[PDB]
Every structure is written in C-alpha cells, then in structure tokens.
Amino acid sequence: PVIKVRENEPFDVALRRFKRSCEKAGVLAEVRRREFYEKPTTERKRAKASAVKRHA
Amino acid sequence: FCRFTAEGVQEIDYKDIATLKNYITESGKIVPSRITGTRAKYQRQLARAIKRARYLSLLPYTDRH
Amino acid sequence: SMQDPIADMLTRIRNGQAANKAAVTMPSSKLKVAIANVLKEEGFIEDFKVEGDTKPELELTLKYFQGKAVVESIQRVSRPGLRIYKRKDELPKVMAGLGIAVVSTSKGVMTDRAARQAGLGGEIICYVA
Amino acid sequence: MRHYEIVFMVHPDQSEQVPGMIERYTAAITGAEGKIHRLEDWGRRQLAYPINKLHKAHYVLMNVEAPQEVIDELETTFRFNDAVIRSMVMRTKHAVTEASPMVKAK
Amino acid sequence: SLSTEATAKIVSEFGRDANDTGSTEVQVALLTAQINHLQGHFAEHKKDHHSRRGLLRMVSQRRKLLDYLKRKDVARYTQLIERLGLRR
Amino acid sequence: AVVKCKPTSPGRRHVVKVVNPELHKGKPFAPLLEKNSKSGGRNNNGRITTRHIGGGHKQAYRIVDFKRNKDGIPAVVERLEYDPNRSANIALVLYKDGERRYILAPKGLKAGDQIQSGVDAAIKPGNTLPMRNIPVGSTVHNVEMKPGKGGQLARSAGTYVQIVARDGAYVTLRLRSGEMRKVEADCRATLGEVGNAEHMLRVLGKAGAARWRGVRPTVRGTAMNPVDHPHGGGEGRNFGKHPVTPWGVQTKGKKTRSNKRTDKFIVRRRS
RNA sequence: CAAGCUUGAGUCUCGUAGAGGGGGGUAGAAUUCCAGGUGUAGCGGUGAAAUGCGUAGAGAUCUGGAGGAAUACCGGUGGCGAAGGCGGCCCCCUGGACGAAGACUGACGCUCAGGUGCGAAAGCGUGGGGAGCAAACAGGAUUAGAUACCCUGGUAGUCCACGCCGUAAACGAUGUCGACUUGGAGGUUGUGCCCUUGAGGCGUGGCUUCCGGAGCUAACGCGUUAAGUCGACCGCCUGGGGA
RNA sequence: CAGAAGUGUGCAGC
Ligand SMILES: [K+]
Ligand SMILES: [K+]
Ligand SMILES: [K+]
Ligand SMILES: [K+]
Ligand SMILES: [K+]
Ligand SMILES: [K+]
Ligand SMILES: [K+]
Ligand SMILES: [K+]
Ligand SMILES: [K+]
Ligand SMILES: [Mg+2]
Ligand SMILES: [Mg+2]
Ligand SMILES: [Mg+2]
Ligand SMILES: [Mg+2]
Ligand SMILES: [Mg+2]
Ligand SMILES: [Mg+2]
Ligand SMILES: [Mg+2]
Ligand SMILES: [Mg+2]
Ligand SMILES: [Mg+2]
Ligand SMILES: [Mg+2]
Ligand SMILES: [Mg+2]
Ligand SMILES: [Mg+2]
Ligand SMILES: [Mg+2]
Ligand SMILES: [Mg+2]
Ligand SMILES: [Mg+2]
Ligand SMILES: [Mg+2]
Ligand SMILES: [Mg+2]
C-alpha cells in the first residue's frame, strides 16, 4: 500500500485514502493471522464452520 | 461474466502481459475469481500464467521489492 | 453382481406397485415368463408381454383395486444361498390358503394348490399375498 | 520429438553477442534434425524487479521441435553460460508459428 | 504408456486381424509388453508405490486371462505361454 | 555395498566390511610402483616420536598424479584399483599418447569414462581446471593451495570442497572441516567428490584387525605410575588431575594453532 | 457335459481435467546469524511484572553475505488418490479416471478365511543437516501450594537418505458388489443439437454439496451418494467392571 | 490477572 499526496490534497484526505487502501489490501488481517501457529485440523475446522454458516 | 469464455480462448498465455495486468491488484496479488467473475478453469489458467510471468520478471511478486 | 434375477423381478414388482407404477419392464427369461404366466392366471397382474429378439424385454402391467395394490406382499423363499424343496405332504399354505406359493414341480411351475392336486413336490420359488 | 518454448534473457552488456548465441543454438537444434518454428528477439526490456542488481535484460524467445536430449543439452549450456541470467523451458501442446503479443505490440 | 505403433504391432502380430483387439491372446500380449516395459521404471523409482499398484493390477488381470484361456483351449494356452515366455 | 558377517566366531560377530566388485582383481601397473619401508614411528635419531605406530602388512607405494598438469590431452579410465596407502581408490587412465597414470577416483567414475585436464576442459567430474574457470558453488576435490604445487585439500574418501565466492584474485573455499579459507584462483581443482564414500561404514571386528593396519595398543595414562604419566598413580582408581597430554599440556579444550604467517588466509575458523 | 449369444466384464481407436506418484533443477517474500555505516537510552515481555538483552552502544535504520525450512495472493462445503494423503514454478519417468463413436473377445464375473502389500503423527537404527518451532530441563511470575496454564531461554525431534515400527476419534463412528423406487437448488468436468448472433436455448454422461417426499428408525435422523425395497460373500456382538 | 471444598442415611402425595 502506497499513497502519493497530490498537490493541494488535504492531509486528512490522504489519511483517509491510506486507511482505506491498507484495509482493502488486508495487510492487518494477514498480520493478525500469522502471529500464532494453527494446526491444519484447526484451519480446516474453521473453514468448514464458516462455510456451514453461509446459508440463508 | 468471464471475458475468456466470451472470447472463446483456448489457453491463456503468460506473454500477454497486457491482459494479465487486468487480473492483479496494484500490489501484484492475484484477484479472486469471486470479483472478476472468471470461470474456474480460466482462473486456474490465470494463476499458472501469472506465476510464470512472475518468474520471468515480467510482473512483480510484490508491491515493494 | 446380479445373482438372483427372480428376486430381481419380485423386487421390481414390489417397488413399482409401491410407487403406483402403471407397468414395469425387466430383462426377459423363460422362468420369468413362466412365473408371470402363473401370476396372470391367479389374477395378481393384468397382463404381460415379451418384446424384442436379441435382448427381449418383459413388461408387466400392474393391477390396483380401489386405489390400492392388489399384490399385498411378494417374497422370495428359495434363494441362491439356501435352496428350499418340499415334499407333497409339506407344501406350505400361504395366508391359510388366501395367498399362493409358486412351486417348480417336475411337471412345471404351478401353484401349491395345483401341485397338491397333481400329487407333486418341487422347489418353492416364492410366496405371494 | 517434442515442441518446446524457450525464453532466455541475457545480461545487457552482452546484447551485441545475442546474434552469436542464437546462431550457435539454432545450429545445435537444426544440426540434430530438430527444427525451429519461430524466433523472436525482444531486445532490452525493463525488469519488474532487480535480479543480480541488473535491469533491462535482453530477452529472446523461440519455439522449437526437438528431441529431449538436444533440449537438455541446450538447457545445460544455458546453465554454465554466464551471459544467460535467467532461463525457462516449457513443453508445448503444439507448434506455434504465430508471433507473440510481445512482438505484435510493436 | 505403451505407444500407439507398438500397440498396433502387437495386435497385428498376435490377433487374427487389426480388428480383433479383444482376443485373449492379444490382451495377454499387451499386458506382458507393458509389464516388461515397466521393469525399467521400478528398477529405479523403487518407492513409486502408486504406480506399482497399477503394475500389480496388470499382473493379476493377466493371470485371470490366462486361467480363462487355459480352461477354453490348452493348445492355444501352450502356444501363447511359450511364445511370450510366461510361467518362468 | 557393506555387508555384515555372520557370527560364526566371536571375532567375526561384529565385522562389517565394504565390498566393491569394480575393483581390479589383479596386480598393479608395475612401472608406477616404489618401495615404501615402514618407520615404526621413529625418526633419524631412532627415538619413537609418534606413539602407537608399528607393524602391519607390507605395502608398495603407488605414484598417484596429484598435479594433473598433462593439459589438453584426453584420457580414458582403464580400471579402478585398490590402493593400500590411502582411503580413496585410484583409477588407471591411458592418455591418447600412450602414457599411463594413476589418479584419485572421483565418485561415480567408471571404466571407459573419458576425462580431460586443462583450461578448456568440460565441467564434468574428473576434469581439472584452474579455479578461476570453475563456476561458484561447484563441488571440487584435490585442490591446490599454491599454483603448480599439486592437490593437497580434500583427498580422503568422500571428501569435497565447495567454492563459495570469487574475488578476482582469490576464491573462498568451505573446507570439509567447516573452515572458510581464501585460496588464489590460479590453483587447480578437480570436479566432483572423492569416491569410496562408504569407507567410514566399515567396522573392524577384532583387536587383530587394527594390528594389520599398523596400530599398536594405546595404554591409558591413568593406568600408569606417576613417573610415567601425569595421570598415573593412585591407591585404586583415582584421578583428581586436570586432563593433560603425556608431556603435561592441557587437553580437552586448550587451543594450539600458532601460525601468524598464514592467519590472513583464514576467513572463519571451524565451528 | 457339449455348442452357441451379447446385455455383465475386458481390449483398441480420439480427446479432457487434475495439490495422483517418483527423481532432478529453480524463484521470490520473510525469520535467524555474521561484517560494516548512521545514531542514542532504552528494548523485550505481561493483566502487571521479573528473568533476559543494552553505554563493552542495544532496539531502530541502511548496505552486503551465509544457511535451513515452508510456498502469501490464486483458494473455493474446489480437484486428485483404495485408504493414509497430495498445494510456488519448470523438466524427465509413471498410474488411474471420464466422454463420443464405433470395432473386437464371448460369462472371462462378485466376494474372500488363511496369506501378501500399502498405511498419519510420535518412536527406533546408521549417516547427514539444523533457520524457525519445541517434549525434557533451567530461571521469572501466579498461587495456600503450582512438579501446570503465562514469560525468558532451550535439548531430542521436526528436514534429508536407507531400514524398522504397524498403531489413531486410521470417522461418513456407516464392509464390497449389483438391481429397483416422487423431486428441488447448486458446484465441477466432458459432449450433442439449435440464427451459435454473446453475458444464449434445449438435451445427454461422470463425480460432488445442501434441503426434503414415500418408507424406515427407540428417537435423533437417513432420504436415488438410503439408515428405503431386495440378492451374493465376508468381518463382528451377546450385561457393567475384572480386561 | 487470582477465586478450592461441601460427611452417611431415609418416609406421603395411586
Ligand atoms: K626395471
Ligand atoms: K586404552
Ligand atoms: K592404580
Ligand atoms: K499424468
Ligand atoms: K485377511
Ligand atoms: K522459543
Ligand atoms: K488457590
Ligand atoms: K535444537
Ligand atoms: K459377570
Ligand atoms: Mg595414538
Ligand atoms: Mg582407543
Ligand atoms: Mg599399576
Ligand atoms: Mg609427575
Ligand atoms: Mg578408592
Ligand atoms: Mg496420463
Ligand atoms: Mg515421523
Ligand atoms: Mg532419527
Ligand atoms: Mg541423527
Ligand atoms: Mg515455553
Ligand atoms: Mg484399532
Ligand atoms: Mg470404526
Ligand atoms: Mg434430507
Ligand atoms: Mg441398503
Ligand atoms: Mg461381561
Ligand atoms: Mg478435600
Ligand atoms: Mg454431597
């Protein structure tokens, strides 16, 4: 995620763009995912349960 | 809808960088077919072609390098 | 693999009549034709037909009375795993004689009532209620 | 015999030698009763990320029909030839005479 | 696997016709051809167990075909096993 | 291959022996033999200067070519032979001019293999080149330490050296000990590894099998009297000393390299 | 017992999809370590601390190098495999599955005691490798205690080659094979026809996810991939502990 | 962030 601030761009608009960019890139989620190991059985269990709840 | 089925492409070519750049984010990550609408067969062809193009340094692996 | 085509025929009858099928089709065979003939004579089915030369099909037209199956039950008794034969003095009576047993006697396939009248035993194929 | 697509890229300082390598390798295939269905020279082209600190490597692409041993000979000469910085051999479903998008972009 | 031209060779060599690809002699010949070819594979890739399962399928199928042929015609059986070198 | 002997006697119970059927079952090439009489570990004063040496089987010296200076002429491997003088096997090779020589046998080399030496040799095992011509990362053996002096590093069975870096005038080598060392790039080396890599798997079953190789018994210092060894003495099994050599220097950790003239060539000591 | 037949079972011809297997190369991001520059007093960790690291210049930041292991995104109740399992890219060798159209053999089939092979992780042997993680172990905390949970370290091991072991909630807690019996919505992969006009309509095969009808079941539930209606063969059970 | 334990044995509502 990179932001170039345009001429006469307000700084807080640049902050808004930076926040939305890094959120859309998923960087923070990817960092939080990797701080602890997860057994493959646990990964598959969470995936399965998420899919199971994706029903109307 | 899927561009490759509308055209009737037989195989996606890693050398068609003008096409492949439409399916990567600005950070170089492969865009999910959920967003592009690409049919699964062509999504798999995209992924292989993009990885080959990365190895040839035609596309970046990462935003930063 | 298929190893008892007679139980196959009987099961096709049972299932088709439970599903209210108008008619059922199965691979033909001399013994199947004989059994269907006996069932038609006893009135458990409306009709039967055989069609084709190289791979003949057999069709049975099922029978219903007041909206319900005329065949109450149909049960294989002799089977490949355990063959059953009876003497003249031991032929069973199905539903005390309301149903029929089908007996392959030495004179051919016939009802147990016929076999008793003829004085024969045989292999007992099935019970029909 | 099998069809292969071969892309190799060369240190820019060696660009003027690219016609020589080609003539050798095009010989090595054809002298083995292989045949070359096409050759494209893309010249110096910018890299997406630095390799060996280099940039602007000189790309060459060719499509060839050859027996396995000739192609593993060619790849093992690419291995020790210090001019070639990166190489790729991909077996191909069919012969391909049509020019690449990289040329037709010109 | 066994190539097209080698297949046609074996078929035209053991069968009555290029047609009779179902004859038991032709099938046993093709199975023997591939079982012989694969010995050069498993001589090296010893731990390729998954491919060995296919190899053993070929072996047991050939066994069954030979038992059938030996029931039908001991003369054709003898000719076949002598020509192919089976039964050690 | 290595084979375990059946225990038909207590001396055979633990024997493991290397069997190699490619080795020549015949007499060596006599024009390349010399006498090699045993020393018993005694110098020109007649004193024992190295303990535990003496006896063993008679041996002839084979003149192995470590210099490989016969550049630009092909040679074919005639056969592999046993050499009693070293752990590696040696190959007899015949040059196109009819000269014969012995070389260290590299791993996987076989009779009928073609080898060549020189600045333009191919990169394949058994070929010899100046190290400035060898790709970095290559595995080599029989490395010269000075140009033209002949190979001195990585000679034993299964050993090899890896070229880690090149600096124009010098190359950095990772030695088999794990030392990192500079060597000047005009030194030659041979591609590949020394063969007979299973040498280390053999087990000598019995005391007598060490005697055949010329090793005499090693009496423990603690078993001696105080006059003989610093560890000697004690009215039982006593120790209470710090461990030392027979001449009183600390063993089990005290370093002993002291060679300031070569230290500049050493990049990182073994670990 | 003899001779037929083509529907079961096989062979061939043309294609398709795939983390199916074995071997060999190779790329990028990141952690760790080592050298060197910038630069000053904290860093790290926690609920808070301390152990620990730091003025002997750490942490942060930039340049260069070494080495090991795993392959973000793609990625999906997606695919492949008998099961265990299999995920960067490329090459070589190699197994199976499925579809269209025929041609061919002519019951060659199903199941299987004993037997044989494969079989996660941990573990064992011999030789390598060792970044990160981490049984054992040490220190700091917490507590009435704390031989734990948490923190700072850390060995076997995890990785490689060749052997052994042969067990798991090795699970769909559901043996293999064959036939029959109302439907609906989706996924994935072939193929036919129709103005192909498309981001289109209608048919026909393989595998797979979720609802639910008759029926079955103690109930929960299963429900054309049956736990429904039948046939062949095999394995297993006979009150709880002891075991 | 910490927070452990609760002696034995019974009887109506037909
Ligand atoms: K002489
Ligand atoms: K001793
Ligand atoms: K003593
Ligand atoms: K394949
Ligand atoms: K068994
Ligand atoms: K740790
Ligand atoms: K407490
Ligand atoms: K460790
Ligand atoms: K009991
Ligand atoms: Mg000694
Ligand atoms: Mg000793
Ligand atoms: Mg004494
Ligand atoms: Mg003394
Ligand atoms: Mg004492
Ligand atoms: Mg295949
Ligand atoms: Mg393990
Ligand atoms: Mg181990
Ligand atoms: Mg070990
Ligand atoms: Mg810990
Ligand atoms: Mg068990
Ligand atoms: Mg079970
Ligand atoms: Mg349901
Ligand atoms: Mg059932
Ligand atoms: Mg009991
Ligand atoms: Mg208490
Ligand atoms: Mg109580």
Coordinates of C-alpha atoms in Angstrom, one line a residue, chain F residues 27-38 57-67 81-88 90 92 101-104 142 149-152 155:
Chain F
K27 CA 48.4 -56.9 -9.8
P28 CA 49.0 -53.2 -10.1
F29 CA 50.7 -51.5 -13.0
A30 CA 54.3 -52.2 -12.1
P31 CA 56.1 -49.2 -13.8
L32 CA 54.3 -46.9 -11.2
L33 CA 55.3 -48.8 -8.0
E34 CA 58.1 -48.0 -5.5
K35 CA 59.4 -49.4 -2.2
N36 CA 57.8 -48.0 1.0
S37 CA 59.5 -49.4 4.1
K38 CA 57.9 -48.9 7.5
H57 CA 51.1 -55.6 6.3
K58 CA 53.8 -54.9 3.8
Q59 CA 52.9 -52.3 1.2
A60 CA 54.2 -50.8 -2.1
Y61 CA 53.7 -47.1 -2.9
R62 CA 51.6 -46.1 -5.9
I63 CA 52.7 -42.9 -7.6
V64 CA 49.4 -41.0 -7.7
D65 CA 49.4 -38.0 -10.0
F66 CA 48.1 -35.1 -7.9
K67 CA 49.3 -32.3 -10.3
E81 CA 42.3 -50.3 -8.3
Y82 CA 42.8 -50.8 -4.6
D83 CA 45.5 -48.6 -3.0
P84 CA 46.8 -49.6 0.4
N85 CA 48.3 -46.2 1.1
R86 CA 45.1 -44.2 1.3
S87 CA 41.4 -44.5 1.9
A88 CA 40.4 -43.4 -1.6
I90 CA 42.7 -44.8 -7.6
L92 CA 44.4 -46.1 -14.0
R101 CA 49.0 -42.5 -14.8
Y102 CA 47.1 -43.1 -11.6
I103 CA 44.6 -40.5 -10.3
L104 CA 42.2 -40.3 -7.4
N142 CA 42.1 -32.3 -4.9
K149 CA 52.3 -27.4 -6.2
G150 CA 49.7 -30.2 -6.7
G151 CA 46.5 -31.0 -4.9
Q152 CA 46.5 -31.0 -1.1
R155 CA 41.9 -36.1 -0.7

